[PDB]
Amino acid sequence: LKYGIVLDAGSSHTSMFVYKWPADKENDTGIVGQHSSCDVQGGGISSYANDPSKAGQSLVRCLEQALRDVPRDRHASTPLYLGATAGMRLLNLTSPEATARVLEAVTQTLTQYPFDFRGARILSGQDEGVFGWVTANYLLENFIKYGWVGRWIRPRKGTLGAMDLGGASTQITFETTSPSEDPGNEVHLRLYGQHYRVYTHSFLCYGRDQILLRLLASALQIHRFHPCWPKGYSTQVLLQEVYQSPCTMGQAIVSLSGTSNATLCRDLVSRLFNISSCPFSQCSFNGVFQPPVAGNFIAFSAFYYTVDFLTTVMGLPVGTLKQLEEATEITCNQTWTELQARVPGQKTRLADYCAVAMFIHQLLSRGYHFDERSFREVVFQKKAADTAVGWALGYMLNLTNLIPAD
Ligand SMILES: Cc1cccc(Nc2cc(S(=O)(=O)O)c(N)c3c2C(=O)c2ccccc2C3=O)c1
Ligand SMILES: Cc1cccc(Nc2cc(S(=O)(=O)O)c(N)c3c2C(=O)c2ccccc2C3=O)c1
């Protein structure tokens, strides 16, 4: 066996994945798998914008684990990559000098481990979307030519669309037969001798944590209470946090209480999605071109954990867009004490499930224009073939050249 390590440096958390695969048949689809993982304590690497040495340091404990997870005599030969995403893209736009110091610091730390360190890079929004789509379809074996002599399956095996909700952006990516009307959104992949025409778009500032900060700025402007927070919940909002984000530009402490108002929560949320103009033949939102969604989809990262809160803790079905919608209202309408009565556990972000759940439902119906028919093909899943679904694997597979173009 051979191994490979990806550090996924997301906006509010760094994650380490160690993959494993047989040396003797490494170019087969679905072959590479997750061997182990590690979660870094504390915030994402961009959080150390003002103390960049701490960013390299935050990675030590997990690096120590990778030394135990990867057998000694293969350290030398095992590639190590760090890919950073929207938090670092944001930090790049507000402070490119701090961004480069952060990446130098992490580079510092990584290059002294005995792995074949190949670089710390910021993924574009296209890469992020595209690599999650690769990951899903690789692990679920959709690049296989199905059938046998001469009863081949016709047409080609359909692929899975991917929706990825991270902390500072969200991505949608799917195979499409519609003409491209924007080349920024056009993707062409060559995988195992096949051509895949793919749409992808990353919405910056539309990740779960940035959505919550924008909701908090608008709740403060319009209401001076938070309709998405539960009645009997209140906190000290630090205006520094709210208004320092590049995502709220265009909006020190204030007490703020929840009111469990689903309709007004839905009003705040729906304001995130500008649908008033479209210079293309069709749009998702904010004037962005998007062809009609089609095929099966997998929705992962924070889509999964929020839906699992609804189905598990709230005990509600989310099989249809409408059950999804009713699940969000019922959650938003709970008081703080009603939430606690369901014995949900020590969830530090319990007050925000309603907002995130409402954001997801708006994003899918008002933003991406799923309806009942097309949402029937969405599954909420975080793992496939015991591997975390995200952009990490497809990234490593592309840098390591494990997928043949032919
Ligand atoms: C790396 C890893 C592996 C297994 C579980 C987790 N926990 C999580 C990992 C992610 S991740 O950023 O998509 O990885 C994530 N987005 C979440 C979690 C969570 O555990 C989680 C728990 C409760 C509410 C929301 C989340 C959540 O959004 C993280
Ligand atoms: C609702 C909401 C809003 C903003 C961020 C989160 N993220 C989280 C919320 C919880 S919670 O304590 O169960 O509330 C939580 N346990 C986690 C997360 C996470 O985001 C997370 C990310 C990566 C690894 C682990 C976690 C995680 O354990 C959840």
Swiss-Prot record:
A GO molecular-function descriptor: nucleoside diphosphate phosphatase activity
UniProt keyword Hydrolase, yes or no: yes
GO BP terms: cellular response to interferon-alpha; cellular response to interleukin-6; cellular response to lipopolysaccharide; cellular response to tumor necrosis factor; G protein-coupled receptor signaling pathway; nucleoside diphosphate catabolic process; platelet activation; purine ribonucleoside diphosphate catabolic process
Glycosylation sites: 27, 92, 261, 274, 333, 398
Keywords: ATP-binding, Calcium, Cell membrane, Disulfide bond, Glycoprotein, Hydrolase, Magnesium, Membrane, Nucleotide-binding, Transmembrane, Transmembrane helix
EC number: 3.6.1.-
Cellular-component GO terms for this entry: basement membrane; cell body; cell projection membrane; cell surface; plasma membrane
Ranges facing Extracellular side: 1-406
Cofactor(s) named in the record: Ca(2+); Mg(2+)
Record flagged with keyword Magnesium: yes
Disulfide bonds: 38-62, 205-247, 228-265, 278-283, 332-354
Induction comment: By FSH in Sertoli cells but not in peritubular cells; by cAMP in both type of cells.
Tissue: Expressed in brain, heart, vas deferens, kidney, skeletal muscle, thymus, lung and spleen. Weak expression in liver.
List of catalytic residues: 128
Residues reported to bind ATP: 167-171
Leading EC class: hydrolase
Domain of life: Eukaryota
Record function comment: In the nervous system, could hydrolyze ATP and other nucleotides to regulate purinergic neurotransmission. Hydrolyzes ADP only to a marginal extent.
Family (UniProt): Belongs to the GDA1/CD39 NTPase family.
Name of the protein: Ectonucleoside triphosphate diphosphohydrolase 2
Source organism of the structure: Rattus norvegicus (Rat)
Shown chain mapped onto the complete sequence: 38 to 451 of 495
